[PDB]
């Protein structure tokens, strides 16, 4: 059942990938035998992955490799980290129970439909020009270093948003309990007046934006009245 | 849309339960404003919960109350904890990304279809007679104090299983990774061969089970193979 899929994967290996693919198969067998819910394939120029992965894993870690696609994901996965795969333009359909998705530094041109219970979404340094609707339970969004123009409406539960180094020409309405917003180096000029909801403890970062004279003066007003920490470029 | 349903429920309180529901409806309002992912209704002895709940929460706690039914759950709920509801007999369809389900010391007769990502399921001390197919990622399972006579196929990653004080006449195949199994005080005459496949480290608990002679022989054969702590006292 599993031996067959993994055998064909190991045999189809180019020289150079033989030790790497062996180490992974050994790890996957270990996972079945002892019940380890975590699978980390390591960095070894992997060009492909097996068709089936152990069914019970909850965490899958894919370090720097040369993948162009990912196989069907474990039906009960809760954490996925993929980084450093520059031929990887898209992701497989995400399992419903996924909680954490770190897909930094690949070449994603889009993102699949996001699982209901997703809490942490970090997809910085990709190729994304837009993003899908956000699930209600989200508490962290990191989408920096992409050519995003706008952002979807944010779930109210959101605690942190990083979207710096994009092409943002506006912001959506803010969640009420936001603690940290970094949108440094975008094309923002008008603040969503929605921002005013941020608490005294909250930290905002607006450096490297044009900002309309009125909006600058309005921010200068907020600091004096709210004691809030807001950073932005200023002449003088 | 939101504060027309929850508003009525606050003043729809049956006489006596008025102060309790106010605290719950305070959290219903308060929770939305400060972002908070958790919600705890407390042991207010509420007869019913609001038709709609905060859309963004991830943890819902429900101590000793007097509920009989439960509303539709938030789409992104991750942890559900319900206990001391001696008249709560069923649960609503569980959210796709539920990870922890603590629904014990109630009066549940049935469980819904389990979310794929469910890792911790504790439903001890209810009224259960069967269980649905187990999520592939399940790790710990507590189903003690019910009326189960059988268990579904166990997933590969299952680590700990407590099923004492049931009517188990039989057991499913063990995943080899299993490390703790308490099936004491059941009606097991014989147990599965999969026991030989378990780690040396695993602790098994069998007391108050009418194990047959041939099984004693098999157990002595298993204990002898690895030194696996398989507890069965003659007394």
Short mmCIF file of C-alpha atoms in Angstrom, two decimals:
data_model
loop_
_atom_site.label_atom_id
_atom_site.label_comp_id
_atom_site.label_asym_id
_atom_site.label_seq_id
_atom_site.Cartn_x
_atom_site.Cartn_y
_atom_site.Cartn_z
CA UNK A 1 0.00 0.00 0.00
CA UNK A 2 2.51 2.61 1.16
CA UNK A 3 5.69 0.68 0.23
CA UNK A 4 4.69 0.74 -3.45
CA UNK A 5 4.23 4.52 -3.70
CA UNK A 6 7.44 5.19 -1.78
CA UNK A 7 9.42 2.58 -3.73
CA UNK A 8 8.49 4.19 -7.05
CA UNK A 9 9.46 7.58 -5.56
CA UNK A 10 12.85 6.30 -4.44
CA UNK A 11 13.57 4.49 -7.71
CA UNK A 12 12.63 7.49 -9.89
CA UNK A 13 15.28 9.53 -8.06
CA UNK A 14 18.04 11.17 -10.04
CA UNK A 15 21.53 10.54 -8.66
CA UNK A 16 22.14 13.15 -5.96
CA UNK A 17 18.61 12.70 -4.63
CA UNK A 18 19.20 9.07 -3.60
CA UNK A 19 20.38 9.78 -0.04
CA UNK A 20 17.76 12.53 0.44
CA UNK A 21 14.81 10.40 -0.67
CA UNK A 22 16.08 7.48 1.41
CA UNK A 23 16.27 9.64 4.54
CA UNK A 24 12.65 10.75 3.95
CA UNK A 25 11.29 7.20 3.41
CA UNK A 26 13.10 6.11 6.57
CA UNK A 27 11.46 9.03 8.39
CA UNK A 28 8.00 8.16 7.06
CA UNK A 29 8.31 4.50 8.12
CA UNK A 30 9.45 5.70 11.56
CA UNK A 31 6.30 7.84 11.67
CA UNK A 32 4.05 4.81 11.10
CA UNK A 33 5.94 2.56 13.53
CA UNK A 34 6.21 4.96 16.49
CA UNK A 35 3.34 7.36 15.73
CA UNK A 36 5.37 10.57 15.28
CA UNK A 37 2.92 13.22 14.10
CA UNK A 38 5.68 15.44 12.64
CA UNK A 39 7.30 14.93 9.23
CA UNK A 40 10.29 17.06 8.19
CA UNK A 41 11.74 16.18 4.78
CA UNK A 42 14.87 18.34 5.17
CA UNK A 43 16.86 20.22 2.53
CA UNK A 44 18.33 18.03 -0.24
CA UNK A 45 17.42 19.35 -3.71
CA UNK A 46 14.21 17.30 -3.78
CA UNK A 47 12.51 17.63 -7.16
CA UNK A 48 9.35 15.74 -6.18
CA UNK A 49 7.55 14.17 -3.18
CA UNK A 50 5.69 10.84 -2.68
CA UNK A 51 2.04 10.62 -3.83
CA UNK A 52 0.90 9.52 -0.37
CA UNK A 53 2.25 10.71 3.00
CA UNK A 54 1.66 8.97 6.38
CA UNK A 55 -2.04 9.43 7.20
CA UNK A 56 -1.76 10.55 10.84
CA UNK A 57 0.75 13.39 10.63
CA UNK A 58 -0.34 16.81 11.86
CA UNK A 59 2.81 18.78 10.98
CA UNK A 60 4.61 18.76 7.66
CA UNK A 61 7.84 20.70 7.15
CA UNK A 62 9.30 21.23 3.67
CA UNK A 63 12.61 23.17 3.75
CA UNK A 64 14.51 24.48 0.69
CA UNK A 65 14.06 22.09 -2.25
CA UNK A 66 13.22 22.24 -5.97
CA UNK A 67 9.54 21.31 -6.03
CA UNK A 68 7.02 22.51 -8.63
CA UNK A 69 4.03 20.99 -6.83
CA UNK A 70 2.96 19.31 -3.59
CA UNK A 71 1.11 15.96 -3.22
CA UNK A 72 -2.27 15.35 -1.57
CA UNK A 73 -1.94 16.58 2.00
CA UNK A 74 -2.69 14.44 5.08
CA UNK A 75 -6.44 14.61 5.76
CA UNK A 76 -5.72 15.72 9.37
CA UNK A 77 -2.81 18.14 8.89
CA UNK A 78 -2.70 21.13 11.25
CA UNK A 79 0.65 22.77 10.42
CA UNK A 80 2.33 23.27 7.05
CA UNK A 81 5.67 25.01 6.49
CA UNK A 82 6.95 25.30 2.93
CA UNK A 83 9.84 27.61 2.15
CA UNK A 84 12.52 28.09 -0.49
CA UNK A 85 10.83 26.35 -3.44
CA UNK A 86 11.06 28.80 -6.33
CA UNK A 87 9.46 26.55 -8.95
CA UNK A 88 6.37 26.20 -6.71
CA UNK A 89 3.64 28.43 -8.17
CA UNK A 90 0.61 27.04 -6.28
CA UNK A 91 -0.52 24.80 -3.39
CA UNK A 92 -2.72 21.66 -3.20
CA UNK A 93 -6.25 21.92 -1.76
CA UNK A 94 -5.80 22.64 1.96
CA UNK A 95 -7.37 20.20 4.51
CA UNK A 96 -10.22 21.68 6.60
CA UNK A 97 -8.48 21.28 9.98
CA UNK A 98 -5.34 23.24 9.09
CA UNK A 99 -4.40 25.85 11.70
CA UNK A 100 -1.01 27.19 10.62
CA UNK A 101 0.28 27.79 7.08
CA UNK A 102 3.78 29.17 6.58
CA UNK A 103 4.54 29.33 2.87
CA UNK A 104 7.33 31.91 2.84
CA UNK A 105 9.69 32.49 -0.08
CA UNK A 106 8.35 30.34 -2.89
CA UNK A 107 6.86 31.49 -6.18
CA UNK A 108 3.13 31.29 -5.40
CA UNK A 109 1.03 33.19 -7.96
CA UNK A 110 -2.17 32.55 -5.99
CA UNK A 111 -3.53 30.81 -2.88
CA UNK A 112 -6.09 27.99 -2.53
CA UNK A 113 -9.40 28.30 -0.63
CA UNK A 114 -8.41 28.80 3.01
CA UNK A 115 -9.51 26.27 5.68
CA UNK A 116 -12.22 27.49 8.16
CA UNK A 117 -10.04 27.13 11.28
CA UNK A 118 -6.85 28.76 10.00
CA UNK A 119 -5.26 30.94 12.70
CA UNK A 120 -1.81 31.78 11.35
CA UNK A 121 -1.13 32.64 7.72
CA UNK A 122 2.37 33.64 6.71
CA UNK A 123 2.95 33.77 2.96
CA UNK A 124 5.55 36.54 2.65
CA UNK A 125 8.03 36.98 -0.23
CA UNK A 126 5.91 35.39 -2.96
CA UNK A 127 4.31 36.48 -6.25
CA UNK A 128 0.75 37.07 -5.00
CA UNK A 129 -1.21 39.90 -6.66
CA UNK A 130 -4.37 39.17 -4.61
CA UNK A 131 -5.73 36.88 -1.84
CA UNK A 132 -8.91 34.85 -1.10
CA UNK A 133 -11.56 35.60 1.55
CA UNK A 134 -10.24 35.17 5.10
CA UNK A 135 -11.60 32.59 7.58
CA UNK A 136 -13.17 34.02 10.77
CA UNK A 137 -10.70 32.55 13.29
CA UNK A 138 -7.55 34.15 11.86
CA UNK A 139 -5.24 35.94 14.32
CA UNK A 140 -2.15 36.49 12.19
CA UNK A 141 -1.67 37.58 8.60
CA UNK A 142 1.74 37.99 7.01
CA UNK A 143 1.70 38.85 3.32
CA UNK A 144 4.72 41.14 3.02
CA UNK A 145 7.02 41.30 -0.03
CA UNK A 146 4.33 40.56 -2.61
CA UNK A 147 2.80 42.78 -5.30
CA UNK A 148 -0.58 43.08 -3.56
CA UNK A 149 -2.74 46.06 -4.51
CA UNK A 150 -5.54 45.69 -1.98
CA UNK A 151 -6.44 43.42 0.95
CA UNK A 152 -9.65 41.47 1.64
CA UNK A 153 -11.96 42.38 4.53
CA UNK A 154 -10.27 41.21 7.73
CA UNK A 155 -11.83 38.86 10.31
CA UNK A 156 -12.52 40.59 13.64
CA UNK A 157 -10.34 38.16 15.61
CA UNK A 158 -7.16 39.40 13.89
CA UNK A 159 -4.27 40.32 16.21
CA UNK A 160 -1.38 41.05 13.81
CA UNK A 161 -1.07 42.14 10.17
CA UNK A 162 2.18 42.46 8.20
CA UNK A 163 1.89 43.62 4.58
CA UNK A 164 4.95 45.88 4.14
CA UNK A 165 6.81 46.08 0.79
CA UNK A 166 3.73 45.74 -1.42
CA UNK A 167 1.91 47.99 -3.89
CA UNK A 168 -1.01 48.78 -1.55
CA UNK A 169 -3.07 51.77 -2.71
CA UNK A 170 -5.59 51.42 0.15
CA UNK A 171 -6.41 49.43 3.30
CA UNK A 172 -9.57 47.54 4.29
CA UNK A 173 -11.51 48.25 7.49
CA UNK A 174 -9.67 47.27 10.67
CA UNK A 175 -10.52 44.55 13.19
CA UNK A 176 -11.29 46.05 16.63
CA UNK A 177 -8.71 44.16 18.74
CA UNK A 178 -5.67 44.74 16.51
CA UNK A 179 -2.34 44.91 18.32
CA UNK A 180 0.19 45.42 15.52
CA UNK A 181 0.00 46.72 11.96
CA UNK A 182 3.01 47.10 9.69
CA UNK A 183 2.32 48.44 6.20
CA UNK A 184 5.69 50.15 5.67
CA UNK A 185 6.69 51.00 2.10
CA UNK A 186 3.41 50.95 0.19
CA UNK A 187 1.43 53.44 -1.92
CA UNK A 188 -0.97 54.42 0.88
CA UNK A 189 -2.04 58.09 1.02
CA UNK A 190 -5.30 58.04 2.99
CA UNK A 191 -5.65 56.18 6.29
CA UNK A 192 -8.82 54.20 6.68
CA UNK A 193 -10.53 56.39 9.29
CA UNK A 194 -11.43 52.94 10.67
CA UNK A 195 -7.90 52.86 12.18
CA UNK A 196 -8.95 55.13 15.07
CA UNK A 197 -10.18 51.98 16.89
CA UNK A 198 -6.64 50.89 17.83
CA UNK A 199 -5.91 50.75 21.57
CA UNK A 200 -3.24 52.66 23.51
CA UNK A 201 -0.90 49.64 23.58
CA UNK A 202 -1.19 49.02 19.81
CA UNK A 203 1.73 49.63 17.42
CA UNK A 204 1.40 50.90 13.83
CA UNK A 205 4.11 51.31 11.15
CA UNK A 206 3.52 53.57 8.14
CA UNK A 207 7.05 54.58 7.01
CA UNK A 208 7.75 54.79 3.25
CA UNK A 209 4.34 55.91 2.07
CA UNK A 210 3.11 59.00 0.38
CA UNK A 211 0.60 60.40 2.83
CA UNK A 212 -1.80 63.20 2.15
CA UNK A 213 -1.02 66.35 4.15
CA UNK A 214 -4.40 66.07 5.91
CA UNK A 215 -3.77 62.44 6.89
CA UNK A 216 -0.30 63.32 8.24
CA UNK A 217 -1.79 66.10 10.36
CA UNK A 218 -4.61 63.76 11.49
CA UNK A 219 -1.97 61.22 12.64
CA UNK A 220 -0.06 64.00 14.44
CA UNK A 221 -3.37 64.58 16.22
CA UNK A 222 -3.91 60.96 17.29
CA UNK A 223 -0.48 60.52 18.98
CA UNK A 224 -1.13 63.49 21.30
CA UNK A 225 -4.62 62.33 22.28
CA UNK A 226 -4.34 58.52 22.39
CA UNK A 227 -0.72 58.00 23.54
CA UNK A 228 -0.61 55.36 20.78
CA UNK A 229 2.65 54.50 19.00
CA UNK A 230 2.35 55.39 15.30
CA UNK A 231 5.41 55.74 13.05
CA UNK A 232 5.39 57.51 9.68
CA UNK A 233 7.64 59.62 7.44
CA UNK A 234 7.69 63.35 8.17
CA UNK A 235 9.36 66.36 6.56
CA UNK A 236 11.74 68.48 8.66
CA UNK B 1 -28.19 41.24 12.29
CA UNK B 2 -26.23 40.27 15.42
CA UNK B 3 -27.62 42.45 18.24
CA UNK B 4 -31.30 41.67 17.61
CA UNK B 5 -31.03 37.93 18.33
CA UNK B 6 -28.63 38.19 21.30
CA UNK B 7 -30.50 41.19 22.73
CA UNK B 8 -33.85 39.30 22.99
CA UNK B 9 -32.18 36.27 24.60
CA UNK B 10 -30.91 38.54 27.42
CA UNK B 11 -34.48 39.58 28.34
CA UNK B 12 -36.09 36.24 27.37
CA UNK B 13 -34.61 34.80 30.58
CA UNK B 14 -37.01 32.64 32.63
CA UNK B 15 -37.47 34.04 36.16
CA UNK B 16 -34.44 33.32 38.35
CA UNK B 17 -31.93 32.80 35.53
CA UNK B 18 -31.95 36.55 34.75
CA UNK B 19 -28.65 37.50 36.50
CA UNK B 20 -26.74 34.57 34.93
CA UNK B 21 -27.75 35.28 31.32
CA UNK B 22 -26.71 38.93 31.78
CA UNK B 23 -23.10 37.90 32.50
CA UNK B 24 -23.17 35.62 29.43
CA UNK B 25 -24.63 38.39 27.21
CA UNK B 26 -22.00 40.80 28.60
CA UNK B 27 -19.29 38.48 27.27
CA UNK B 28 -21.32 38.21 24.01
CA UNK B 29 -20.92 41.98 23.63
CA UNK B 30 -17.51 42.46 25.29
CA UNK B 31 -15.79 39.59 23.43
CA UNK B 32 -16.36 41.19 20.00
CA UNK B 33 -14.79 44.52 20.96
CA UNK B 34 -11.44 43.40 22.45
CA UNK B 35 -10.89 40.71 19.78
CA UNK B 36 -10.67 37.91 22.40
CA UNK B 37 -10.59 34.33 20.96
CA UNK B 38 -11.96 32.70 24.14
CA UNK B 39 -15.50 32.65 25.60
CA UNK B 40 -16.49 31.22 28.99
CA UNK B 41 -20.18 31.29 29.97
CA UNK B 42 -19.38 29.97 33.47
CA UNK B 43 -21.54 27.84 35.78
CA UNK B 44 -24.56 30.17 35.63
CA UNK B 45 -27.07 27.30 35.45
CA UNK B 46 -28.42 28.55 32.12
CA UNK B 47 -31.42 26.74 30.63
CA UNK B 48 -30.53 27.77 27.05
CA UNK B 49 -27.73 29.46 25.03
CA UNK B 50 -28.20 32.22 22.34
CA UNK B 51 -29.15 31.25 18.77
CA UNK B 52 -26.03 33.05 17.49
CA UNK B 53 -22.50 33.29 18.99
CA UNK B 54 -19.38 35.49 18.46
CA UNK B 55 -18.27 34.76 14.86
CA UNK B 56 -14.50 34.89 15.48
CA UNK B 57 -13.88 32.74 18.59
CA UNK B 58 -11.64 29.66 18.80
CA UNK B 59 -12.27 28.42 22.36
CA UNK B 60 -15.72 27.91 23.91
CA UNK B 61 -15.96 26.79 27.55
CA UNK B 62 -19.22 25.65 29.20
CA UNK B 63 -19.08 24.55 32.89
CA UNK B 64 -21.99 23.13 34.94
CA UNK B 65 -25.31 24.32 33.50
CA UNK B 66 -28.79 23.05 32.59
CA UNK B 67 -28.79 22.94 28.79
CA UNK B 68 -30.63 20.33 26.71
CA UNK B 69 -29.60 21.54 23.23
CA UNK B 70 -26.84 23.64 21.60
CA UNK B 71 -26.77 26.29 18.81
CA UNK B 72 -24.85 26.19 15.52
CA UNK B 73 -21.13 26.52 16.28
CA UNK B 74 -18.79 29.27 14.92
CA UNK B 75 -17.13 28.27 11.64
CA UNK B 76 -13.55 28.56 13.01
CA UNK B 77 -13.97 27.01 16.47
CA UNK B 78 -10.95 25.00 17.58
CA UNK B 79 -11.70 23.98 21.19
CA UNK B 80 -15.06 23.02 22.70
CA UNK B 81 -15.45 22.20 26.40
CA UNK B 82 -18.84 21.15 27.85
CA UNK B 83 -19.39 19.43 31.21
CA UNK B 84 -21.88 19.01 34.06
CA UNK B 85 -24.87 19.33 31.72
CA UNK B 86 -26.77 16.26 32.95
CA UNK B 87 -29.52 16.74 30.33
CA UNK B 88 -27.37 17.57 27.29
CA UNK B 89 -27.98 14.54 25.07
CA UNK B 90 -26.51 15.50 21.66
CA UNK B 91 -24.03 17.86 19.95
CA UNK B 92 -24.41 20.09 16.84
CA UNK B 93 -22.37 19.53 13.66
CA UNK B 94 -18.75 20.16 14.67
CA UNK B 95 -16.68 22.91 12.93
CA UNK B 96 -14.24 21.75 10.22
CA UNK B 97 -11.13 22.76 12.15
CA UNK B 98 -11.98 21.53 15.63
CA UNK B 99 -8.90 20.21 17.42
CA UNK B 100 -10.04 19.66 21.01
CA UNK B 101 -13.42 18.29 22.07
CA UNK B 102 -14.12 18.01 25.79
CA UNK B 103 -17.73 16.88 26.16
CA UNK B 104 -17.78 14.70 29.28
CA UNK B 105 -20.00 14.25 32.37
CA UNK B 106 -23.08 15.16 30.30
CA UNK B 107 -25.79 12.82 28.94
CA UNK B 108 -24.69 12.39 25.30
CA UNK B 109 -26.20 9.38 23.52
CA UNK B 110 -24.56 10.08 20.15
CA UNK B 111 -21.63 11.93 18.56
CA UNK B 112 -21.72 13.77 15.21
CA UNK B 113 -19.29 13.15 12.34
CA UNK B 114 -15.85 14.00 13.71
CA UNK B 115 -13.69 16.79 12.19
CA UNK B 116 -10.58 15.46 10.34
CA UNK B 117 -8.19 17.49 12.51
CA UNK B 118 -9.60 16.41 15.88
CA UNK B 119 -6.61 15.36 18.02
CA UNK B 120 -8.02 15.30 21.55
CA UNK B 121 -11.43 13.73 22.21
CA UNK B 122 -12.69 13.30 25.78
CA UNK B 123 -16.30 12.13 26.16
CA UNK B 124 -16.05 10.06 29.35
CA UNK B 125 -19.05 9.61 31.68
CA UNK B 126 -21.96 9.96 29.24
CA UNK B 127 -24.49 7.49 27.79
CA UNK B 128 -22.71 6.39 24.60
CA UNK B 129 -23.38 3.07 22.86
CA UNK B 130 -21.25 3.59 19.75
CA UNK B 131 -18.67 5.90 18.18
CA UNK B 132 -18.28 7.38 14.68
CA UNK B 133 -15.23 6.81 12.45
CA UNK B 134 -12.14 8.26 14.14
CA UNK B 135 -10.26 11.25 12.65
CA UNK B 136 -6.92 10.23 11.10
CA UNK B 137 -5.03 12.68 13.33
CA UNK B 138 -6.55 11.65 16.68
CA UNK B 139 -4.03 11.19 19.48
CA UNK B 140 -5.79 10.85 22.83
CA UNK B 141 -9.19 9.22 23.31
CA UNK B 142 -11.23 9.07 26.51
CA UNK B 143 -14.57 7.28 26.30
CA UNK B 144 -14.73 5.85 29.84
CA UNK B 145 -18.00 5.54 31.78
CA UNK B 146 -20.34 4.73 28.89
CA UNK B 147 -22.07 1.68 27.39
CA UNK B 148 -19.77 0.89 24.47
CA UNK B 149 -19.43 -2.76 23.53
CA UNK B 150 -17.10 -2.07 20.61
CA UNK B 151 -14.60 0.50 19.30
CA UNK B 152 -14.05 1.76 15.71
CA UNK B 153 -10.77 1.21 13.88
CA UNK B 154 -8.08 3.22 15.68
CA UNK B 155 -5.96 5.71 13.69
CA UNK B 156 -2.18 5.25 13.39
CA UNK B 157 -1.21 8.14 15.67
CA UNK B 158 -3.42 7.22 18.61
CA UNK B 159 -1.24 7.41 21.73
CA UNK B 160 -3.51 7.07 24.75
CA UNK B 161 -6.88 5.38 25.10
CA UNK B 162 -9.06 5.22 28.20
CA UNK B 163 -12.15 3.00 27.97
CA UNK B 164 -12.70 1.58 31.48
CA UNK B 165 -16.22 0.95 32.88
CA UNK B 166 -17.88 0.09 29.54
CA UNK B 167 -19.19 -3.20 28.07
CA UNK B 168 -16.33 -3.84 25.61
CA UNK B 169 -16.60 -7.51 24.58
CA UNK B 170 -13.92 -6.96 21.93
CA UNK B 171 -11.15 -4.53 20.95
CA UNK B 172 -9.90 -3.22 17.59
CA UNK B 173 -6.36 -3.62 16.23
CA UNK B 174 -3.81 -1.46 18.03
CA UNK B 175 -1.75 1.11 16.18
CA UNK B 176 1.86 0.17 17.00
CA UNK B 177 2.62 3.65 18.38
CA UNK B 178 0.07 3.30 21.23
CA UNK B 179 1.63 3.85 24.65
CA UNK B 180 -1.22 3.84 27.20
CA UNK B 181 -4.37 1.72 27.19
CA UNK B 182 -6.88 1.39 30.04
CA UNK B 183 -9.72 -1.00 29.23
CA UNK B 184 -10.27 -2.18 32.79
CA UNK B 185 -13.72 -3.32 33.97
CA UNK B 186 -15.06 -4.49 30.64
CA UNK B 187 -16.39 -7.80 29.30
CA UNK B 188 -13.27 -8.90 27.39
CA UNK B 189 -12.74 -12.67 27.29
CA UNK B 190 -9.98 -12.39 24.71
CA UNK B 191 -7.86 -9.55 23.33
CA UNK B 192 -6.18 -8.93 19.95
CA UNK B 193 -2.82 -10.23 18.67
CA UNK B 194 -1.87 -6.62 17.83
CA UNK B 195 -0.71 -6.48 21.46
CA UNK B 196 2.58 -8.18 20.49
CA UNK B 197 3.16 -5.25 18.12
CA UNK B 198 3.13 -2.62 20.89
CA UNK B 199 6.25 -0.89 22.18
CA UNK B 200 8.13 -2.22 25.20
CA UNK B 201 7.31 1.10 26.91
CA UNK B 202 3.50 0.80 26.60
CA UNK B 203 1.37 0.42 29.76
CA UNK B 204 -1.77 -1.75 29.44
CA UNK B 205 -4.53 -2.00 32.11
CA UNK B 206 -6.93 -4.99 32.14
CA UNK B 207 -8.40 -5.49 35.67
CA UNK B 208 -12.01 -6.67 36.13
CA UNK B 209 -12.04 -8.35 32.74
CA UNK B 210 -13.08 -12.01 32.54
CA UNK B 211 -10.04 -13.08 30.49
CA UNK B 212 -10.12 -16.74 29.46
CA UNK B 213 -7.30 -19.22 30.19
CA UNK B 214 -6.02 -19.27 26.59
CA UNK B 215 -5.76 -15.47 26.80
CA UNK B 216 -3.70 -15.76 30.02
CA UNK B 217 -1.41 -18.00 27.98
CA UNK B 218 -1.20 -15.42 25.17
CA UNK B 219 -0.59 -12.60 27.68
CA UNK B 220 2.22 -14.56 29.35
CA UNK B 221 3.56 -15.07 25.80
CA UNK B 222 3.38 -11.31 25.07
CA UNK B 223 4.82 -10.09 28.43
CA UNK B 224 7.64 -12.59 27.86
CA UNK B 225 8.43 -11.26 24.37
CA UNK B 226 9.29 -7.66 25.30
CA UNK B 227 8.77 -6.94 29.02
CA UNK B 228 5.77 -4.76 28.15
CA UNK B 229 4.00 -3.70 31.38
CA UNK B 230 0.66 -5.52 30.93
CA UNK B 231 -1.26 -5.22 34.21
CA UNK B 232 -3.61 -8.01 35.24
CA UNK B 233 -4.02 -8.93 38.91
CA UNK B 234 -5.60 -12.27 39.86
CA UNK B 235 -7.49 -10.58 42.71
#
